[PDB]
């Protein structure tokens, strides 16, 4: 098949490029190489194909070439938009590989701090049981956060680990807080207050 | 220019026949070196291949599975077709046909995407429950309502407030998997409290698999 | 120190060229002009032949 370096990481501004090896290539005299680019939530579109060019509405910024047996793609100019999959593909003897992945780390940005929203529970579930109260987080950098649900004792979460990283337009990765409130504890529960933690600025 | 739409039933019982079809339009497949093939791609993990047909029926196949992958070609309707059999509880993925213009370009224009999650359940009533946005809310910034649509196994589901205008403004964030085996979604909209009283809101649940499109909003309420 | 060599260039330099030029190295998100920033650099480097 084809392997692919799991993590790279990349300034903004340099250039990085990726390897994509033989590994037993029974691709013969791998001819024809090219490489795609899947956003978290979207479909892969192509960005070069037969390296040697490249197709119609893609940068310059994207360029490849194949010394010997390995294909790289070089990637000049990185920006904020380009942490994505990228993924080689050719033609074997009897099938056609699609390789591994390779997901792209452009450091390099101040670390966002996530707002909480503590949306109350209308009028309509409570009646039927099903308290459900939410506080849902978004907008940070890191990526790691930890809920502290707590109505003023031991903080547990019971269900608000779901690492969603959620690479939308602003780069920033979101959360997902789902409560567990049992539908008989809404009334001795105060207000049950929502405190999150996050990477650095733990308070 | 091209567009290759999926469709078919998401959900389905196990050990089954797919009928995945893959509408195409903009093009001809009877060019020379064009073709429609299939491409799958596990959650976390690589894309693999599966089937590709030709503009001459040709149907070429992947060489570990070959008694189950059938393509077929309805150039008079222009729908390409795929049926898979054995249905395991490995193969859950979100299938992509995507247009094989000639041998340099491999696959160039892909498609959307339609995950197939079939392992045990069958589908689950959705639960329909707009968050009120209340003076927490409101005082608390911008008063984000979020429908609380949870309760149904299959993952993909749209939603939009206000369907046709206010495309930004709603999170969509994906659903978190609890113990009970369910999905469960809380998007909310960041339209801040201008306007939002003496209006209507409703975040149009699309769960397709289920066939239910209940559209409800909600008053302030006060704690 | 009467020996310079140029350390830090943009692109790879094409046959027979000679880059007369000392223009201070670039970088990201920042117009650094080149009096002292950290993250651009002096082209050129002196030897140190002892």
């Known amino acids: 098949a084809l392997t692919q370096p799991a993590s790279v990481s990349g300034s903004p501004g340099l250039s990085i490029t990726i390897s994509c090896t033989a590994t037993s290539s029974d691709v013969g005299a791998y001819n024809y190489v090219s490489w795609y680019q899947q956003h978290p939530g979207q479909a892969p579109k192509l960005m070069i194909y037969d390296v040697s060019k490249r197709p119609s509405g893609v940068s310059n910024r994207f360029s490849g070439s194949k010394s010997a047996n390995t294909a790289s793609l070089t990637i000049s100019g990185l920006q904020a938009e380009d942490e994505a999959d990228y993924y080689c593909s050719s033609y074997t003897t009897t099938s056609v590989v699609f390789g591994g992945g390779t997901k792209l780390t452009v450091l390099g940005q101040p670390k966002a701090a996530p707002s909480v929203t503590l949306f109350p529970p209308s009028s309509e579930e409570l009646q039927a049981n099903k308290a459900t109260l939410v506080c849902l987080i978004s907008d940070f950098y890191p990526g790691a956060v930890t809920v502290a649900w707590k109505a003023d004792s031991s903080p547990v979460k019971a269900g608000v680990e779901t690492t969603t990283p959620s690479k939308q337009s602003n780069n920033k990765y979101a959360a997902s807080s789902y409560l567990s409130l049992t539908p008989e504890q809404w009334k001795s529960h105060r207000s049950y207050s929502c405190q999150v933690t996050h990477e650095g600025s733990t308070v | 220019q091209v567009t290759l739409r999926e469709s078919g039933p998401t959900l389905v019982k196990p050990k089954q026949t797919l009928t995945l079809t893959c509408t195409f339009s903009g093009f001809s497949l009877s060019t020379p070196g064009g073709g429609v093939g299939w491409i799958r791609q596990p959650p976390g993990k690589a894309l693999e291949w599966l089937a590709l047909?030709?503009?001459?029926?040709?149907?070429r196949y992947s060489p570990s599975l070959k008694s189950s992958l059938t393509i077929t070609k309805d150039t008079s309707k222009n729908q390409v077709v795929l049926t898979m059999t054995n249905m395991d509880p490995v193969d859950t993925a979100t299938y992509y046909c995507?247009?094989?213009?000639?041998?340099?370009?491999?696959?160039?224009?892909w498609g959307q995407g339609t995950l197939v999650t079939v392992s045990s359940a069958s589908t689950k009533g959705p639960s329909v429950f707009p968050l009120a946005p209340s003076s927490k809310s409101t005082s608390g910034g911008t008063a984000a309502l979020g429908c609380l649509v949870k309760d149904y196994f299959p993952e993909p589901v749209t939603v939009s407030w206000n369907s046709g205008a206010l495309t930004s403004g709603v999170h969509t964030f994906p659903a978190v998997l609890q113990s009970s085996g369910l999905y469960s979604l809380s998007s909310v909209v960041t339209v801040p409290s201008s306007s939002l009283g003496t209006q209507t809101y409703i975040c149009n649940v699309n769960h397709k698999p289920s066939n239910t499109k209940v559209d409800k909003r909600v008053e302030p309420k006060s704690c | 120190y009467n020996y310079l060599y140029r350390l830090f260039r943009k692109s790879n330099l094409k046959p027979f060229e000679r880059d007369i030029s000392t223009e201070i190295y670039q970088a990201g998100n920042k117009p650094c002009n080149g009096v002292a920033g950290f993250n651009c650099y002096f082209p050129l480097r002196s030897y140190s032949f002892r």
């Open positions: 047909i030709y503009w001459d029926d040709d149907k």
């Open positions: 995507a247009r094989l213009t000639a041998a340099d370009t491999i696959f160039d224009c």
